[PDB]
Amino acid sequence: IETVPVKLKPGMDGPKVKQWPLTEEKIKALVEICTEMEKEGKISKIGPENPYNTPVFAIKKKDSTKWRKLVDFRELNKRTQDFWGIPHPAGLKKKKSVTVLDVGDAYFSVPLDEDFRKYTAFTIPSINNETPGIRYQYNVLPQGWKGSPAIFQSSMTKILEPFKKQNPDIVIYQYMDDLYVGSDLEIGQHRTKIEELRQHLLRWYELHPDKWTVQPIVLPEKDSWTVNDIQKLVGKLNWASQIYPGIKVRQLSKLLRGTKALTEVIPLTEEAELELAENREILKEPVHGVYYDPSKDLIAEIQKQGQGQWTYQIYQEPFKNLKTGKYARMRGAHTNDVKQLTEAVQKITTESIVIWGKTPKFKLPIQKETWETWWTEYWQATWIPEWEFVNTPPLVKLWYQ
Amino acid sequence: MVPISPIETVPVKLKPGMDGPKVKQWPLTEEKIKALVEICTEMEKEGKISKIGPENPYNTPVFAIWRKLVDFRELNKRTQDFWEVQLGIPHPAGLKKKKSVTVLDVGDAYFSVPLDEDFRKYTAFTIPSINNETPGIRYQYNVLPQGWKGSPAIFQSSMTKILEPFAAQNPDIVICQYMDDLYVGSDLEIGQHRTKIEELRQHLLRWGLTTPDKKHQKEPPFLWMGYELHPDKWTVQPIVLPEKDSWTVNDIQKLVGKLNWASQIYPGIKVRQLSKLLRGTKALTEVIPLTEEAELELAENREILKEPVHGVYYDPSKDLIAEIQKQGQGQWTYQIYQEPFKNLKTGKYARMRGAHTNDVKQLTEAVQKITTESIVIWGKTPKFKLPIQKETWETWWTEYWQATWIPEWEFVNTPPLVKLWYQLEKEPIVGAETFYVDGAANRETKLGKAGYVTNKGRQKVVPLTNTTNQKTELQAIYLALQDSGLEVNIVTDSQYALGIIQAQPDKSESELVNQIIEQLIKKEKVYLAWVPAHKGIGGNEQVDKLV
Ligand SMILES: *CCC(=O)N(C)c1cc(Oc2ccccc2OCCn2ccc(=O)[nH]c2=O)c(C)c2cc(C#N)ccc12
C-alpha cells in the first residue's frame, strides 16, 4: 500500500531488448491477458517516450489449458540494484519432500515505485510488423522481476508467520514467484498440508530430494576382457585421474602391449586385478577439497546419451563436481530432442534452486539457432537461466554413461 | 465553430546531463531572408510557431532551399531516445487480399499535433535581419517540426490513439498507418466501403484533421519499397541485369543487391560466386575479373529473370507449405506457398562459415530460418517438404550427439536428396583388421611421420614435409583407410581427429579431411576407437613416428 524507492545500478541505463517473433495464438493470448490486466490496473499503456523494452511470450503450465504470460526479465534483473540478505536454508535439500507453489498473484497487490515503472516496459508484437506493437508498463510488482520477492519479503513473513509458528518442522523457502515447502510427512499428509497452506494463503509438484544422491564413477565387472574393453577402461581411468589423484593405469596398460585384435580376449594378470581394485577403492571415496563459493557462478553441463537419457554435472571449478545426475524421464517428448533438453534444463535449474538458492549457467549440446527457435515452446517455469552453446562433441560423454 | 478535440501531448525530455542546442546562425542573403520572413509569417498565422523574446538562449540554424528547412541535427543529438516507429518492414506476402483498398492523405495532420510546451523552448530559431542592423526574428515551434528526432513516433502514436475507437467499432475493415498516409481495406461492397471511408474522414475531422476531398494521387499498382502491389498479386519492381563488358566492385554489389532482392519471389537465384568475388576486397573502384562459375551462375540468373513472376497474398483459411531444394556449394532454395504453382514467396539460404559441415545440418538451419521468417510474416510455422527420407532423418537425430528437431514435415522425392554418407559402428568389428595409427611432427623443421601397425603384421610409416601434429594424425587415419578392406577397426590417440569425425562431416575446407571422408564412403564397416597417448598402450606406437 506504500511504494518502496527502487533504482538501477550506477551508470546503467534501463533494458532495451528486442522482442522476438511470436505465433498468432500466443499474440492473441497476450492481448486477452493484457486487456484483463489493464482493466485491473496492473499494467498501463505507454507512449513513444518510453524507449525501454523487455521480451514477453506466453506458455501453458502443467495440467492447465489456460495461457500464462511470461516475461524475460533477465536483463532488467541483472541491471537492477542488488537487494539485501537471507542465508539459504541448507536443510531444504535434506528434507524428504518439497512442494513448489506459484505465489506470483500476491505480487500484484503491491504497487510499484513510480519512477521505476518505465523500466518494466514490454511490447506485444504485431504479425508482419504492421504496427510498432502494443506497449505496456507495470504499475505493481511484476512476476519474474528479482525486486518483487525482495519487496514482498516482509508481507510474506507476516502471512507465513502463523503457519511457521504452527509447524517448526516444515522448511519454507522463496525464490522469484515460487515457494518451496519441505517436510518429512507422508504423501497424503503432505498433500493435505499443502492444501492447508494454500487455503491459508488464499484468505490473505511432488519433489523428493531424499531420493536424490550424487553419482560415483563405476568401473565394469567382467570375467573376460577384450582389448577394446581394456582400452576403454584405461581411457576412463585416465580421465578419472584428473579428479582422483591416486588413479594408476600402468599395470592395465601393460596388458595392451602388442598389436592385438580389438575383440581378442585378454586375461588379467594379478597386478592388473590389484590395480583395478585399488582404483575401485579410490573411486568409492568422495572428491578431495570440494566446496561451494557463493561468489562464483554455477556451471551445468548436459550430455545427450540417447534413448531419452541425459546426464548432467553441476560444478564451479573443473573436475570439482558439486552435483551429478541422470535425467531419463519420458513425458510426451519421445520424438523431440529439444523438448527433452528443455525439460532437463528446467529440472536441473529447480534442483540448483533447492540446493544453492540460485540458477546455474548451462552449456547446452545444441546449435544456437535450433535452441533459440524452439525452447519457448516447451518452457513451463517462471524463471529463466543463462545458457551457452557447445559446438564440439565432448569426449567425456560415454565416461558419464 | 465546432469544438475541436485536443490531442494529448507527449512529455519529452533531453538526454540526461545534456543541455539544449546553442548553434550559431549562418548569415543569409537578403532574398533568402525575405523569403523566410514571409514563410514564417504565414506559419505564425497558422499557429505552427510563435515569436519569443531574448530570454530564450537556445538556437537552431535555419535555411532556405522558397522552402524553409531547419537543421535539427544538434537537438537530435541532445533529444531523448524514443520507441521505434517500426520494428521491421512488412512483407507483401503477409498482406491479406481485400475487395477495396483506399488511400487517405493525412499529411496536414503532421503540423497539427502539438509539441510538449516544456520542450518548445529547445526548438528556438532566429531569422537574420536585413544587413543585421536589427535583432533577428526569434521563433519557437508549437508542433512537431519536420526533421526533429521525435516527430514520426509521436505522430504515429497520436494517430493510433485517435484511430483506436474507430477501428474497434468497425472490425469489418482494416486500417493501417504508414508515414502520412492511411490505408483502409475491406471486403464490403464498394458503396459500403466508400461510406465507411467517409465515416473515417469525419471521425478524423472531429480532431480538426483534414483529409483531401481531391482524389488521392496513389493508385494501382502501388509502388512501395521496391515492390509492386496489385489488387490480386504482388511482385518486385522490375529487376534488370545490365550487360557489362567488364564489371567493377560497385557493379557486382549492385548485381548482388538486385539478385538478393529478386530472390524473394524469383525461385532459384544464386549469389555464391558473384558475392565470392567480393571477398576481402574493401575497394569500391577495383575491377575484378569474373570467373567462369560466376558466368554460369549469372547466365542461370538471366534465364530465371527473363519474364515476370508474381506472388499471391495470404489466405489464413489455407495451410502454409514450405518446400526446400539443395543447390550445391552450401546453397539452398525454398518456396513458401498455399496452393501448388502459386507461391506466396521464395528465398535462399547459404551455409554459415565453418571448417566442416554436412547437408543435414544445413537443411536443419534452413528449416529454422524459414520457420522464423514464417512466424514473422504469417504468425505460424509452415508444413515442410524436405528432400530427405524419414529413415535418414531418424537415423541422424537418434545418433547425433547434439539435440536437434525439425517441425512437422514430409518427404518429397526431388534430387539431390540429403543422405547420410557414412555411419561409424558402435562396437568393434569381429574378423576385421585392427589398425593402430599415429602421427607426429617437429615444431621447428615441420617434418613429421604418419603410419600404422596392425594385428596381422601390416605396417607403414610415411615421412612428411611441411606438416603439423594434427595433419600427421589425420594422415595416419587416412593411410589406415587406404590400405584396409571393407571392414576395419581403427585405433588412434588423436582427440583432434576424433573431434572432427564425431562431428560427421561430408565436406571440409581441409582436403585431407575430404580424402578421409571419401575413404569412409567406400567402406562397409568402420569402428573408430580412441585411446590415451603416452600411456604405454601397446600397438599405439608414438616412438615409431617420432624417429
Ligand atoms: C500501413 C500500410 C503498410 O504498412 N503497408 C505495407 C502497405 C499495405 C498496402 O495494402 C493494404 C493496405 C490496407 C489493407 C490491406 C492491404 O493489402 C491487402 C492486399 N492488397 C494490396 C494491394 C491492393 O491493391 N489490394 C490488396 O488486396 C498498401 C496498398 C501499401 C501501399 C503503399 C504505397 N504507396 C505503402 C504501404 C502499403
Side-chain angles (χ1 to χ4, degrees), chain A residues 1-6 8-401, chain B residues 1-23 25-44 46-66 68-212 214-216 219-278 280-281 283-547:
Chain A
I1 202 62
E2 176 58 33
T3 63
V4 35
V6 184
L8 298 170
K9 294 176 181 177
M12 288 189 176
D13 196 21
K16 296 181 176 180
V17 183
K18 161 191 166 60
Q19 170 65 58
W20 53 74
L22 308 178
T23 61
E24 184 173 12
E25 59 170 354
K26 297 183 177 59
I27 292 180
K28 281 146 112 171
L30 290 176
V31 166
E32 245 168 315
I33 293 169
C34 287
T35 293
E36 191 68 19
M37 297 179 69
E38 187 178 12
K39 287 176 185 170
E40 294 171 352
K42 298 171 178 173
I43 60 181
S44 289
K45 291 196 182 309
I46 57 176
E49 74 281 5
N50 190 328
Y52 310 107
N53 194 69
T54 282
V56 57
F57 62 110
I59 61 175
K60 292 173 76 283
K61 301 210 300 179
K62 302 184 184 63
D63 315 325
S64 182
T65 328
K66 174 185 179 60
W67 286 96
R68 194 187 193 275
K69 172 169 160 295
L70 215 296
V71 184
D72 176 17
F73 278 128
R74 282 179 289 180
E75 187 66 25
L76 177 62
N77 280 338
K78 65 182 56 179
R79 286 176 183 262
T80 296
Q81 62 187 170
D82 296 337
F83 283 81
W84 46 267
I86 292 184
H88 183 74
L92 179 62
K93 55 169 147 58
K94 303 173 179 300
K95 283 297 176 299
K96 300 299 181 177
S97 299
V98 176
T99 298
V100 191
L101 287 161
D102 189 21
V103 298
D105 294 326
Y107 293 161
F108 292 162
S109 64
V110 175
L112 183 57
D113 179 30
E114 193 91 20
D115 291 25
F116 196 83
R117 293 183 181 181
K118 60 192 175 78
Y119 299 123
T120 65
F122 62 96
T123 304
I124 297 179
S126 67
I127 300 180
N128 206 22
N129 303 324
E130 289 151 355
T131 82
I134 306 176
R135 298 224 75 208
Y136 287 103
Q137 83 183 1
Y138 268 93
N139 301 317
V140 300
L141 297 178
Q143 307 184 17
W145 183 50
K146 77 169 187 179
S148 297
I151 287 169
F152 202 75
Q153 190 169 90
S154 56
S155 307
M156 185 59 69
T157 302
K158 283 197 180 69
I159 301 178
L160 293 179
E161 187 63 275
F163 199 93
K164 292 181 68 178
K165 270 184 172 56
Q166 190 179 21
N167 300 84
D169 312 275
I170 295 180
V171 181
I172 298 184
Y173 179 65
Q174 188 178 29
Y175 186 85
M176 294 303 177
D177 323 330
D178 285 337
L179 210 62
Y180 299 84
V181 175
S183 64
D184 314 78
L185 311 184
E186 191 190 349
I187 173 64
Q189 310 168 0
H190 191 98
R191 288 181 182 181
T192 57
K193 254 292 179 296
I194 281 305
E195 294 176 348
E196 167 184 343
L197 184 51
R198 79 172 61 179
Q199 68 175 348
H200 186 277
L201 299 171
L202 193 148
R203 72 165 182 265
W204 287 65
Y205 199 11
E206 35 270 314
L207 204 169
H208 310 279
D210 72 324
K211 294 183 58 182
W212 285 102
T213 42
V214 194
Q215 273 50 237
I217 305 174
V218 305
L219 305 177
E221 290 181 352
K222 291 175 170 293
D223 296 332
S224 57
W225 296 78
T226 68
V227 179
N228 188 249
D229 294 326
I230 300 184
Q231 284 176 3
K232 295 189 301 182
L233 177 61
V234 168
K236 189 172 182 181
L237 288 171
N238 180 67
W239 160 79
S241 66
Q242 297 175 109
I243 301 172
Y244 291 89
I247 297 295
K248 158 194 167 187
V249 305
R250 62 172 302 177
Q251 299 298 323
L252 280 165
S253 301
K254 222 183 173 185
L255 309 170
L256 299 178
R257 281 200 163 116
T259 72
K260 294 158 179 291
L262 281 189
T263 62
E264 204 185 275
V265 175
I266 290 186
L268 299 190
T269 59
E270 197 179 324
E271 306 85 343
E273 280 180 276
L274 178 61
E275 192 188 68
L276 177 57
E278 298 170 11
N279 289 331
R280 293 193 201 270
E281 297 177 24
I282 290 179
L283 287 181
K284 287 185 298 185
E285 302 179 27
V287 190
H288 173 264
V290 163
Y291 67 97
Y292 169 72
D293 190 346
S295 63
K296 294 183 181 184
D297 286 333
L298 290 170
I299 297 174
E301 286 191 355
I302 300 178
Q303 303 83 27
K304 165 185 178 187
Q305 298 290 353
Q307 307 185 35
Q309 294 176 133
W310 307 76
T311 46
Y312 67 91
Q313 306 81 34
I314 307 179
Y315 63 91
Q316 294 183 330
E317 304 290 333
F319 310 107
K320 303 290 188 180
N321 286 332
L322 306 173
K323 178 72 166 63
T324 64
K326 192 172 180 298
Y327 157 84
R329 181 98 64 177
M330 170 182 170
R331 286 170 48 189
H334 176 88
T335 185
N336 191 320
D337 265 350
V338 174
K339 186 174 182 179
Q340 298 179 24
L341 181 54
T342 302
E343 296 173 356
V345 171
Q346 289 175 100
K347 289 190 176 183
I348 297 162
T349 307
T350 292
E351 298 178 25
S352 188
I353 285 173
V354 174
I355 302 174
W356 303 279
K358 66 180 183 182
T359 67
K361 184 186 183 62
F362 289 82
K363 293 184 182 176
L364 299 179
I366 187 177
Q367 284 303 115
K368 172 183 179 179
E369 292 72 22
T370 307
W371 174 260
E372 293 187 341
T373 300
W374 293 106
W375 73 262
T376 59
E377 300 286 351
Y378 322 111
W379 199 259
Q380 287 176 329
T382 63
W383 28 255
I384 303 172
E386 305 286 346
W387 45 62
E388 51 194 1
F389 308 103
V390 19
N391 309 122
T392 308
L395 181 48
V396 302
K397 160 200 169 185
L398 265 183
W399 293 331
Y400 284 117
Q401 180 78 328
Chain B
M1 175 192 179
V2 196
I4 293 177
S5 300
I7 300 178
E8 199 177 357
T9 60
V10 176
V12 175
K13 301 177 187 174
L14 295 175
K15 291 180 174 181
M18 290 189 179
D19 191 28
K22 279 171 285 191
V23 186
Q25 163 76 46
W26 269 8
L28 292 179
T29 80
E30 181 171 352
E31 174 183 2
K32 296 177 178 179
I33 292 176
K34 292 180 177 178
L36 294 184
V37 168
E38 186 170 3
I39 298 179
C40 281
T41 309
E42 180 186 359
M43 289 183 57
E44 182 188 12
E46 288 170 325
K48 310 183 188 187
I49 60 187
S50 286
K51 293 188 174 184
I52 55 177
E55 307 80 20
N56 202 293
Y58 307 104
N59 190 72
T60 309
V62 72
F63 301 91
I65 294 186
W66 300 62
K68 179 180 82 93
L69 160 141
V70 188
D71 187 40
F72 283 112
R73 296 201 298 268
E74 188 68 21
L75 179 60
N76 295 341
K77 291 175 185 176
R78 299 158 178 273
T79 309
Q80 66 161 91
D81 285 335
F82 289 92
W83 184 248
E84 275 82 346
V85 71
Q86 55 188 82
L87 297 178
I89 309 172
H91 196 278
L95 312 181
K96 308 177 202 248
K97 211 185 310 171
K98 297 299 175 181
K99 277 196 183 67
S100 342
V101 168
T102 318
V103 190
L104 266 60
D105 178 20
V106 293
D108 267 341
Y110 203 102
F111 69 84
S112 298
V113 177
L115 181 66
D116 190 28
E117 190 169 7
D118 294 271
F119 200 86
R120 299 181 187 183
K121 64 175 182 291
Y122 302 136
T123 64
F125 65 99
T126 313
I127 306 179
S129 174
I130 308 287
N131 300 321
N132 201 27
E133 288 179 350
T134 43
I137 313 290
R138 292 280 285 168
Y139 280 104
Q140 81 179 7
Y141 269 91
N142 297 313
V143 303
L144 310 173
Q146 294 176 345
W148 179 57
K149 181 183 177 184
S151 290
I154 292 176
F155 174 79
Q156 185 179 67
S157 58
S158 307
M159 190 59 57
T160 298
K161 287 221 300 179
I162 288 178
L163 293 180
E164 181 169 324
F166 193 97
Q169 297 189 24
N170 296 265
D172 52 5
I173 67 175
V174 167
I175 303 182
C176 186
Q177 325 170 43
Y178 187 85
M179 300 223 192
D180 59 329
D181 294 292
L182 300 181
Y183 297 85
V184 196
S186 192
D187 290 333
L188 307 174
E189 280 289 341
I190 181 67
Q192 297 182 293
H193 184 92
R194 299 178 186 265
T195 290
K196 292 204 172 186
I197 289 300
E198 286 312 297
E199 295 183 342
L200 178 55
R201 300 184 60 196
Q202 169 183 354
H203 177 94
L204 287 177
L205 201 134
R206 288 188 172 180
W207 275 268
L209 310 183
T210 34
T211 69
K214 161 185 293 181
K215 29 265 154 294
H216 196 267
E219 42 198 3
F222 303 92
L223 309 184
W224 166 79
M225 295 293 297
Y227 290 112
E228 294 183 8
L229 312 176
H230 302 261
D232 64 325
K233 62 189 174 296
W234 73 273
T235 188
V236 293
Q237 289 173 21
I239 298 293
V240 178
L241 305 188
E243 308 278 346
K244 294 273 92 59
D245 314 342
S246 75
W247 308 69
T248 68
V249 155
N250 49 26
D251 293 340
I252 292 179
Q253 294 179 348
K254 275 177 167 293
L255 196 67
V256 74
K258 278 187 172 63
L259 286 176
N260 292 334
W261 181 253
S263 60
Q264 60 190 300
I265 188 49
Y266 285 99
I269 295 293
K270 303 174 186 174
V271 301
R272 165 151 177 85
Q273 310 289 342
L274 306 174
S275 184
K276 179 195 297 184
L277 270 50
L278 302 173
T281 62
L284 301 181
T285 55
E286 185 180 4
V287 183
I288 306 178
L290 315 315
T291 59
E292 190 54 79
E293 321 301 322
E295 290 284 351
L296 226 310
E297 195 179 71
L298 173 55
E300 294 171 9
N301 291 331
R302 298 186 186 272
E303 190 65 21
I304 297 175
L305 298 188
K306 167 175 288 188
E307 47 193 20
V309 180
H310 301 274
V312 297
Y313 292 131
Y314 178 60
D315 180 20
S317 63
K318 303 176 180 177
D319 274 330
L320 197 72
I321 305 166
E323 190 167 337
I324 306 184
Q325 300 91 32
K326 175 196 178 180
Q327 293 181 306
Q329 301 86 41
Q331 289 182 119
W332 304 76
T333 193
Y334 68 87
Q335 306 85 46
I336 308 183
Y337 60 90
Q338 299 180 292
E339 299 284 314
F341 317 110
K342 310 250 267 298
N343 286 336
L344 287 168
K345 74 185 292 293
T346 65
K348 60 182 169 57
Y349 173 77
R351 62 155 187 252
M352 301 182 303
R353 305 281 241 273
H356 318 293
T357 192
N358 68 72
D359 293 339
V360 186
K361 299 180 184 180
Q362 301 180 4
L363 182 62
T364 300
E365 299 165 351
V367 173
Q368 313 297 4
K369 163 185 176 176
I370 294 165
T371 302
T372 297
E373 182 183 59
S374 306
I375 292 180
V376 169
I377 300 174
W378 302 288
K380 57 171 295 185
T381 302
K383 172 134 190 171
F384 284 93
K385 293 178 182 172
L386 308 186
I388 178 177
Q389 299 279 11
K390 283 287 172 173
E391 189 173 13
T392 298
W393 172 253
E394 180 168 33
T395 300
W396 166 259
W397 80 264
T398 46
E399 300 296 340
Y400 197 29
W401 72 273
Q402 275 189 342
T404 184
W405 161 261
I406 242 68
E408 176 174 355
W409 68 286
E410 61 185 334
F411 167 61
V412 48
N413 197 340
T414 303
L417 295 182
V418 179
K419 52 175 292 188
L420 298 176
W421 293 98
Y422 58 87
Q423 296 157 236
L424 307 186
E425 302 294 295
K426 296 186 178 62
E427 300 295 340
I429 311 162
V430 176
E433 197 170 351
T434 302
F435 283 66
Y436 298 82
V437 306
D438 204 334
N442 179 263
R443 319 182 193 277
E444 297 81 1
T445 68
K446 297 184 297 185
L447 293 175
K449 295 178 177 185
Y452 60 79
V453 297
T454 88
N455 65 296
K456 296 180 61 187
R458 193 189 316 269
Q459 297 195 10
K460 170 176 288 191
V461 182
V462 171
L464 308 163
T465 69
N466 188 26
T467 185
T468 56
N469 278 319
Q470 299 177 345
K471 275 168 162 293
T472 54
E473 298 167 353
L474 292 175
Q475 193 76 47
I477 291 184
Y478 176 57
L479 288 175
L481 291 165
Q482 272 198 352
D483 311 337
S484 47
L486 295 169
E487 308 185 343
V488 58
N489 305 302
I490 299 181
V491 175
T492 172
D493 58 18
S494 172
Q495 308 179 40
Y496 172 74
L498 201 72
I500 289 184
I501 298 182
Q502 284 181 343
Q504 304 194 80
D506 55 31
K507 270 208 164 190
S508 181
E509 293 172 334
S510 172
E511 191 209 6
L512 186 49
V513 181
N514 290 324
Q515 287 163 354
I516 291 178
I517 293 170
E518 292 292 327
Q519 289 297 324
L520 291 173
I521 294 180
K522 298 174 187 172
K523 296 295 185 183
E524 295 298 88
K525 296 183 173 184
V526 175
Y527 176 75
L528 188 57
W530 178 88
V531 294
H534 299 145
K535 277 302 177 176
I537 290 182
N540 198 70
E541 244 67 289
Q542 196 84 33
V543 299
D544 207 336
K545 290 83 185 183
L546 268 169
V547 176

